[PDB]
A paper describes a structure:
Te_[name] and Pm_PhnD have 2–4 orders of magnitude higher binding affinity for phosphite than phosphate and phosphonates, but whilst attempts to crystallise complexes of either protein with ethylphosphonate (EPn), 2AEPn or phosphate were unsuccessful, structures of both proteins in complex with methylphosphonate (MPn) were obtained. The overall fold of the Te_[name] and Pm_PhnD complexes with MPn were very similar to the comparative complexes with phosphite (RMSD cα: ~0.3 Å) and since both MPn complexes were determined at high resolution (1.41–1.52 Å), the electron density for the ligand could be confidently interpreted within the binding pocket, with the MPn refining unequivocally in only one orientation. Given this similarity, it was unsurprising that the three oxygen atoms and the phosphorus atom of the MPn bind in the same position as those of the phosphite, with the methyl group of the MPn pointing in the same direction as the R1 hydrogen of the phosphite, towards the capping tyrosine residue (Y208/Y206). To accommodate the methyl group of the MPn the tyrosine moves in both structures by ~0.5 Å, compared to the complexes with phosphite, resulting in an ~16% expansion in the volume of the binding pocket. Despite this movement, the methyl-carbon atom of the MPn lies ~3.0 Å from the plane of the tyrosine ring in both structures. This might suggest that a C-H…π interaction is present, however the relative geometry of the two partners is sub-optimal for this type of interaction. Thermal ellipsoids were calculated from the anisotropic B-factors for the three structures that were better than 1.5 Å resolution (Te_[name] and Pm_PhnD with MPn and Pm_PhnD with phosphite).
Residue numbers in the entry: 9 to 268
Write the structure that this text describes.
Amino acid sequence: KANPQKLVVALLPDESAATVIQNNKGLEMYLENKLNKDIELFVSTDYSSMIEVASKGRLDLAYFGPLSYVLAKTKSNIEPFAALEKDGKNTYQALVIGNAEAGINSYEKIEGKIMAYGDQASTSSHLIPKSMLKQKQLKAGENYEEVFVGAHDAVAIAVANGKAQAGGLSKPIFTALIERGTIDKNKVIIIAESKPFPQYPWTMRSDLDSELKTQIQQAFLELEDKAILKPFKADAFTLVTDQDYDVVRNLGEVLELNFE
Ligand SMILES: [Mg+2]
Ligand SMILES: [Mg+2]
């Protein structure tokens, strides 16, 4: 188990499994050649399931969301090591979006309506947009109805089709969904955008052989291939450590969220 021949690699189900797998094929092939190991991918049904599988010691690498990383780290022997870098920044934002047909173009128009969030353990499709709504005196179950639709693509689709009047999701995913034709830009209005949060961490099992750990980190750092990272509109990977996610811990405290 310190130097396995094949690596079990989990990817966050932030969108449909097909989409996540397809976007990662380039990276998988690169890493298999760089490391001379076979990679075997796993995409869970939901974020909590991925956390559980990490906590049980089944994974060698895992591409977590920021919040789901913080949660896993409480009960898993894992460490973050890399994150996507774009135009020199290693952060991303959440959006609050509204249904255009219903004229949902401000926070005031959310009141008394349906707000879609993704997975309960989502940073950019739950915690962050919820915080943004709270700062605008909107409170779930008091002056709006919340629905958890389980993923970012599910949020965008729900808002675009008017099943939900507003929603919160990843800015990069929203962009990708528009660029790929999945979402019609004319059917949604951007209401607000969040402050920058740290990018998703790539993580590894901490009891992998120290030489292998370095090889893995170095492999990510060495990647110079805009084509491989094109699905993520990214330049390169940079380094990250556990402390970079303290901002997410702090937000989780602010909102008094109970994952236990
Ligand atoms: Mg493979
Ligand atoms: Mg699911």
